[PDB]
Amino acid sequence: LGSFNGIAAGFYQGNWAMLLTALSSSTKNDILATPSIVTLDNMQATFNVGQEVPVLTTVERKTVGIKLKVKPQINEGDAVLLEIEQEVS
């Protein structure tokens, strides 16, 4: 009973009984991440936000966040090249 959720209706007429059981549940989640940066073309810049937590591999440092790094190459008058990698953890 400490964990139950919903409704149920008690009825008794002599010998019988019955319990109705139902519930509705829903959950919604959103996120958004907009980082921005500047650098020169050939040198790589890297960027990250978020906490850091250690695992037992005696252990090492581990980071959890938004590690967005890239490499910009400007070719034409207007065009660019982006070997980007990142994760939202």
Binding site: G2, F4, N5, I7, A8, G10
Partner: protein, 51 residues
């Protein structure tokens, strides 16, 4: 910055159903066990929900 809100009710009847919500922080179990234990003992007993 972070904002947060909540809201919810619950019902109970010896002859009738039971509308429980655990997210709220307190079941009806806290109540049915709070008052029959209260007025049984007369007053509060620490056995009640430490929540």
């Amino acid at each position: 910055d972070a904002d947060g809100l909540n809201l919810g009710i619950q019902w109970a009847n010896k002859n009738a159903g039971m509308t429980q919500f655990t997210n709220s922080g307190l079941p009806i179990s806290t109540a049915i066990a709070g008052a029959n234990q209260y007025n049984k003992d007369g007053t509060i007993s620490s056995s009640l929900a430490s929540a």
